[PDB]
Amino acid sequence: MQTVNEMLRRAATRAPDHCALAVPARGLRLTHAELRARVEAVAARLHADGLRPQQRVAVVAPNSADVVIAILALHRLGAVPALLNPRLKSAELAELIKRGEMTAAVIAVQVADAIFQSGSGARIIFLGDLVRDGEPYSYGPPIEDPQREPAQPAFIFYTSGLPKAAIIPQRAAESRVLFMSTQVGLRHGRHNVVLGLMPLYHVVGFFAVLVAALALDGTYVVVEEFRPVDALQLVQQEQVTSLFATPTHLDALAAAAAHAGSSLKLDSLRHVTFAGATMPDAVLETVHQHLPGEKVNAYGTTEAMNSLYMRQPKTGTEMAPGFFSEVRIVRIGGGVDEIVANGEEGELIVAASDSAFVGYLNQPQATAEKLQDGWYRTSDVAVWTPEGTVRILGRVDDMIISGGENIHPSEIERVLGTAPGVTEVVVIGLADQRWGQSVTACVVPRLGETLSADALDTFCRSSELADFKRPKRYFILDQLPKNALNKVLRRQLVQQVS
Amino acid sequence: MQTVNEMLRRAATRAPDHCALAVPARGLRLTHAELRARVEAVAARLHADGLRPQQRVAVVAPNSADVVIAILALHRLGAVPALLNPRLKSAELAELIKRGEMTAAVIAVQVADAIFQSGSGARIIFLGDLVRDGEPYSYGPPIEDPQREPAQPAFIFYTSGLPKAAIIPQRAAESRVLFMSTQVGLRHGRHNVVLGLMPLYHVVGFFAVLVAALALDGTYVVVEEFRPVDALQLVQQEQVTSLFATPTHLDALAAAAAHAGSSLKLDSLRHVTFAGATMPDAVLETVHQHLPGEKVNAYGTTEAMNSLYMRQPKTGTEMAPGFFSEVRIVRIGGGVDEIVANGEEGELIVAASDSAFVGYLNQPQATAEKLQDGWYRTSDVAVWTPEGTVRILGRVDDMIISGGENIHPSEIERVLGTAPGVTEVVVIGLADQRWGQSVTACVVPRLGETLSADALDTFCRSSELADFKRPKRYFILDQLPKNALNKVLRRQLVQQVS
Ligand SMILES: O=C(O)c1cccc(Cl)c1
Numbered sequence A, B: 001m002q003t004v005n006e007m008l009r010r011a012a013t014r015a016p017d018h019c020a021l022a023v024p025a026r027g028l029r030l031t032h033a034e035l036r037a038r039v040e041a042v043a044a045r046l047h048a049d050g051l052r053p054q055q056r057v058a059v060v061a062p063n064s065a066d067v068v069i070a071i072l073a074l075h076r077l078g079a080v081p082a083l084l085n086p087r088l089k090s091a092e093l094a095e096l097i098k099r100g101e102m103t104a105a106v107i108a109v110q111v112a113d114a115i116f117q118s119g120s121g122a123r124i125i126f127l128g129d130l131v132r133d134g135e136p137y138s139y140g141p142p143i144e145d146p147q148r149e150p151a152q153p154a155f156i157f158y159t160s161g162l163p164k165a166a167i168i169p170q171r172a173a174e175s176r177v178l179f180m181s182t183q184v185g186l187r188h189g190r191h192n193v194v195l196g197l198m199p200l201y202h203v204v205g206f207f208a209v210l211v212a213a214l215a216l217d218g219t220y221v222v223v224e225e226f227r228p229v230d231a232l233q234l235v236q237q238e239q240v241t242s243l244f245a246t247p248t249h250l251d252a253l254a255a256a257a258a259h260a261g262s263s264l265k266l267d268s269l270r271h272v273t274f275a276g277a278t279m280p281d282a283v284l285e286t287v288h289q290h291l292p293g294e295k296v297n298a299y300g301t302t303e304a305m306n307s308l309y310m311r312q313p314k315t316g317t318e319m320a321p322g323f324f325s326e327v328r329i330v331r332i333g334g335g336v337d338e339i340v341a342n343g344e345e346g347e348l349i350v351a352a353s354d355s356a357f358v359g360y361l362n363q364p365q366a367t368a369e370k371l372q373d374g375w376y377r378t379s380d381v382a383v384w385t386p387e388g389t390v391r392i393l394g395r396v397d398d399m400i401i402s403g404g405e406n407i408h409p410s411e412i413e414r415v416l417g418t419a420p421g422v423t424e425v426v427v428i429g430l431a432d433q434r435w436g437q438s439v440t441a442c443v444v445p446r447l448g449e450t451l452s453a454d455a456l457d458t459f460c461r462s463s464e465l466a467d468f469k470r471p472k473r474y475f476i477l478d479q480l481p482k483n484a485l486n487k488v489l490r491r492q493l494v495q496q497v498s
């Protein structure tokens, strides 16, 4: 195997004086060799204070050079970084750190208050006391490089109840990085300038962006806060070769580029990658018109990383397996060998090989639901297209079954989202009749505007949707309940309207 | 890990009906699924005759669809293919199979005579009795897929005394394939059409060409015999995306393309890769002028695969480490930690990690010479250029040390090779004076032509060579002694002229 530490160490010997970390705002550049020296020093200093290999340390911070040093430092020591979204509720973060029996918590968020008062006896480390603007506080004797095993825990990442802690083994690093090369077409070399738009607590942000950038002897451009015109200036200024970004980032970037034209020089950007299963046709449309570089749509999971992709995509929902990947579509709630007839819908399962998580920390029942007979079960519904591609339909959990028929809310949402006057829409099934579930649309109007059930129904009737998929009922709401992050709490919403 | 078998198996599930093997001459195409079925059937039939996992089977055959099936078949069974050059002497092949305690010998070469009469009780299998033109003789019950371990032997390849048997472990396959992607820029997908110019008994021919082609869900184009104009027609006809070829192939191909112009459509060819350390500046020159695609120079060994490379190269001798690679230049005949001053010459050693051989079969002394303290020693002399690239000078064994000075015969040979009237030249050191060794040139004239020591000396004097490097003596010969393959036996030649 080749671990994160080894990938980064080998890179440092090949390109010691090439720029590793760029923070254009803070006037901060760090070479590969200089990044190593700080990783070594924070490692040693963390060790000199009683942190041992395999001890889980929480990390809760926005993107920055300092948090990159600290995360790599912990891994170099041998500790297992558990990376957590800083948008989470103080209460949630304290609770997650408690369940995880975490030894320490590196924070740069008040949230420190919550952790002491949770019971969890996790040592609160403030990030600014380890490393500040790339320069660390040093002390302690230089430290040994611990022995690392293929199945051994290496990093913990969190999912979608409370977020679950997915354990990423040492051997998963390489293929979690190299798919950026086999699928996306990144290659080794110092031309690589990678814009860090993705948060570091998401596996793409860490393995596919941060680690890939350095492991290929390139440069990682730190972005502490996303602004669409500023990001495009970075593309031009830094000579960005690739960016991996959310559908929401790309909508912003494409529109800013459209209201920029040849004001910004974007030619250096050769790779625009995104997880676009949920990307509407209209955003995809603008991405091709207004942004340069080859576009690659990618499907993946925290649990197994990349499982499908598409070069120069037409719809955002249709993709095919790449290198490392093996996939099947099986009967919903059946065994891993129950393959559907091409054309019938089912659950996407992918083989659980090198890139796979090895279980959810302290949640062995959820693990047993997800890892069966060598497969990882996505909980996503899919269908083989006659053209040999996989069409992602939606989450199994969001699926509505009305009059014995599979209806996917995401399909209805993308239609209703184009209805004039609509700012947000979530489609849900209410426990009911026609039977089983009744398709119901919850719609938020644009600021100042009225909506009516009649007008929306007329709009749906005049759209491509088939009979049974048309909502039977509409609720016009001033907002939708959306947890600590900005994703809808369907269950909670269903509970609100009934 | 991801083994050859697993790489090819996963590929078959992703692209069952895409063309895997093309033999345009024989009118033979085989899809991925069809190639699998034959690999399964020859495997089973080989098993039904008493071949067990980990038993070494020799393979001695020119390139063909049938030998690809048989090699993959043996690996699928679990047997360890030992691939041998068919150009070797009958006596040599019998002897190598004897030392290797090989259980069987798959041959398609008389050479069968030699093997029985060597003592080695290796079962002689004729290739035409396993599979002919892609259709096998089937029998026996379908067979289990054996458990494979990371350090376990998988394939045996032979080197430069008698050729040594380098044992390639299961875990070496992935990085021996994926460097074609990280260094060379191959990516996953069915556009991949790979021309099989390289012999299958060379690690590049097997891992970097055959296995890479299939593992990326592409097509391998079988070439049973190299002809420069025919090969270029294949590029055009088959839509070849990449070729990996020897310097000798590229000289032929470039000249045929120059005496073709826009007669042949070569635009589909995006990657032209070669091991060009020994490629003269003039051939490289023509490669850029007359052949399309990005040119990539690559340095590597049987023992550790790829260790250096260069995109769009200027000299053929200057390269830098890519992904997976770590390299040092150390004092000749010193410890792995004795790094030279940048500018001093030394031995190129590369780290022995995932891609590395695990030893020479039954030759533990040679192993101990080559694998020290986690490094592989190339036996190649190199120097760091002020620009941070590695300049390969020549083999340590060919090095001449005259008047206490490092002189590399390859440098002198490339100068003398341009002297009009010269068809071949080898430079050697004779045990002698000035002192230690005396630089001596052995030159073969062109058909019908005379050479003189005086005229050659005049030519050298008028060349870029420094004082001490000029040959002190010339031998004009009608030929140079060149073993079973076409490489010069320096030791033997030295012995001839003295
Ligand atoms: O969260 C995702 O969409 C994701 C996660 C891992 C890998 C990929 Cl390609 C995508």
Ligand SMILES: O=C(O)c1cccc(Cl)c1
Pocket (backbone or CB within 6 Å): B203, B204, B275, B298, B299, B300, B301, B302, B304, B305, B306, B307
């Ligand atoms: O024999 C060579 O030159 C060789 C062997 C393995 C890998 C490479 Cl890139 C080159």
